[PDB]
Amino acid sequence: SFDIELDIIGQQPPLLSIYTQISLVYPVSDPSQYPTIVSTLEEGLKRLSQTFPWVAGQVKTEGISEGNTGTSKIIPYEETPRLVVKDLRDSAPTIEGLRKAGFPLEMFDENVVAPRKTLAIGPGPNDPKPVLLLQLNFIKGGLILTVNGQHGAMDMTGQDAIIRLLSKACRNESFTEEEISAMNLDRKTVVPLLENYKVGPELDHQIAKPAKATWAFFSFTPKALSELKDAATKTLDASSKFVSTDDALSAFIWQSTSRVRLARLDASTPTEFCRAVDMRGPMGVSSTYPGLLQNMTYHDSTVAEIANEPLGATASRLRSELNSDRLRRRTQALATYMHGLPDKSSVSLTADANPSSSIMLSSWAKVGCWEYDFGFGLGKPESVRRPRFEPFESLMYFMPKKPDGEFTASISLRDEDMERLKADEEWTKYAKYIG
Ligand SMILES: CC(C)(COP(=O)(O)OP(=O)(O)OC[C@H]1O[C@@H](n2cnc3c(N)ncnc32)[C@H](O)[C@@H]1OP(=O)(O)O)[C@@H](O)C(=O)NCCC(=O)NCCS
Ligand SMILES: [Ca+2]
Numbered sequence: 001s002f003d004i005e006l007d008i009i010g011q012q013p014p015l016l017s018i019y020t021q022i023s024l025v026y027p028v029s030d031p032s033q034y035p036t037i038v039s040t041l042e043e044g045l046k047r048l049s050q051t052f053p054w055v056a057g058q059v060k061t062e063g064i065s066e067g068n069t070g071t072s073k074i075i076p077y078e079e080t081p082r083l084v085v086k087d088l089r090d091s092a093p094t095i096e097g098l099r100k101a102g103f104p105l106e107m108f109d110e111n112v113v114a115p116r117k118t119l120a121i122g123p124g125p126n127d128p129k130p131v132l133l134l135q136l137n138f139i140k141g142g143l144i145l146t147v148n149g150q151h152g153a154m155d156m157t158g159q160d161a162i163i164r165l166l167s168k169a170c171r172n173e174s175f176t177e178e179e180i181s182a183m184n185l186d187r188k189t190v191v192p193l194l195e196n197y198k199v200g201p202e203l204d205h206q207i208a209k210p211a212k213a214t215w216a217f218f219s220f221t222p223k224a225l226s227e228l229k230d231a232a233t234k235t236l237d238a239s240s241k242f243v244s245t246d247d248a249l250s251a252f253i254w255q256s257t258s259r260v261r262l263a264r265l266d267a268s269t270p271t272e273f274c275r276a277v278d279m280r281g282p283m284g285v286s287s288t289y290p291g292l293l294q295n296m297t298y299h300d301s302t303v304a305e306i307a308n309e310p311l312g313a314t315a316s317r318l319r320s321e322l323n324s325d326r327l328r329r330r331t332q333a334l335a336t337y338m339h340g341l342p343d344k345s346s347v348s349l350t351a352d353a354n355p356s357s358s359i360m361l362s363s364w365a366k367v368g369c370w371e372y373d374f375g376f377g378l379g380k381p382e383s384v385r386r387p388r389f390e391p392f393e394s395l396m397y398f399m400p401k402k403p404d405g406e407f408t409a410s411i412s413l414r415d416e417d418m419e420r421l422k423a424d425e426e427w428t429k430y431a432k433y434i435g
């Protein structure tokens with residue numbers, strides 16, 4: 001009953017090996033509630049799958065051979081997205097353990113809380129690759145819900161949209177006309193192909209071609225971010241105009257990471273900042289589109305230049321690449337190039353990134369997960385975290401922005417960079433180490 005080709009941009013072999021994971025933590029007053037929470041989610045899963053069968057599907061890659069990396073599509077699998085129910089109460093994280101340590105990354109082992117791993121290591125192209133998987137974990141005093149999305153099938157914006165709709169389905173609210181439209185948008189049409197196009201310099205950053213490290217959460221108060229944004233605004237351009245909180249925080253991290261790396265790299269070492277960008281707005285596509293519609297902006301400089309310039313100069317680099325005409329062009333050029341490319345081996349969103357000196361950041365600040373209750377009766381989440389996976393130097397995320405305005409960055413860096421950052425006086429003025 002369905003055969004849905006992925007977004008041409010989602011046909012990148014890296015995206016086809018990745019699951020995006022997100023965990024929502026809730027307190028549970030009484031364990032008598034657990035079976036009720038399970039039943040409520042099961043019924044939302046059915047309700048969502050009845051309106052939108054494909055959410056329950058699987059990703060299949062057809063026509064692989066030497067010279068052809070294949071074409072992927074969503075096909076039937078089970079009747080609902082697979083749900084794992086895991087009782088950790090019988091040593092797992094507890095709600096009180098989580099509260100006292102500040103809901104640290106340490107305590108969100110993907111092996112413990114998630115139904116599948118982020119990276120395609122271990123088992124299991126004849127193994128199932130579901131579009132969406134859920135794990136409901138029982139913990140002492142609480143509940144962790146973890147949601148997995150196959151990355152070629154969805155970016156985190158699209159996963160959040162699906163999760164929002166599962167929450168509606170769980171409290172038996174009908175989907176609007178608008179939401180049905182977005183869920184049903186033709187993925188092939190979403191990025192219009194360019195009529196005449198030959199690949200040139202615009203796709204360089206997306207065409208090419210391990211040291212001891214860890215992961216840590218860092219938190220930024222609304223007040224620290226407000227001061228960061230002001231200090232960027234106070235030192236702007238002035239081609240622009242304005243910078244956002246997200247711009248300033250991204251710039252402060254590039255400067256700060258650059259700064260500490262001056263202890264181990266030449267001043268003139270090239271540094272590339274890669275920053276994820278939701279392409280839904282610029283493409284003229286509904287914000288509720290569930291697919292993969294993302295690109296990155298790229299920023300090349302040198303470690304010493306970035307560390308030693310005003311924050312406004314750094315934030316401006318970032319804001320300047322958000323020109324809508326340019327984002328569209330670059331994205332449509334990518335889509336056109338890939339459409340006509342049988343072997344997509346050299347294509348990657350981080351093709352030219354160097355783990356030693358780059359930064360690869362994805363801001364999930366705008367995702368709405370702090371708002372979903374799922375009819376569970378537990379209120380809104382107490383914590384929204386991205387589970388920990390293997391150390392991956394220079395890879396970074398911002399978590400969905402807490403309703404109070406707090407930001408948290410999930411940061412991976414090699415040990416000496418991590419320890420120099422944590423000890424950095426200017427960094428710790430604004431950033432609190434959670435771990
Ligand atoms: C690129 C991106 C990170 C930037 O986020 P952002 O800066 O918060 O959002 P916008 O670019 O839309 O700007 C909105 C902000 O700019 C401000 N702003 C917008 N226009 C303005 C103007 N004309 N004058 C002054 N301020 C303005 C807003 O007040 C808001 O600022 P605030 O958050 O500091 O209060 C974000 O748009 C994005 O694409 N996020 C998703 C990344 C992604 O795909 N990751 C998922 C991985 S699968
Ligand atoms: Ca290149």
Ligand SMILES: [Ca+2]
Nearest residue numbers: 204205207352
């Ligand atoms: Ca290059």
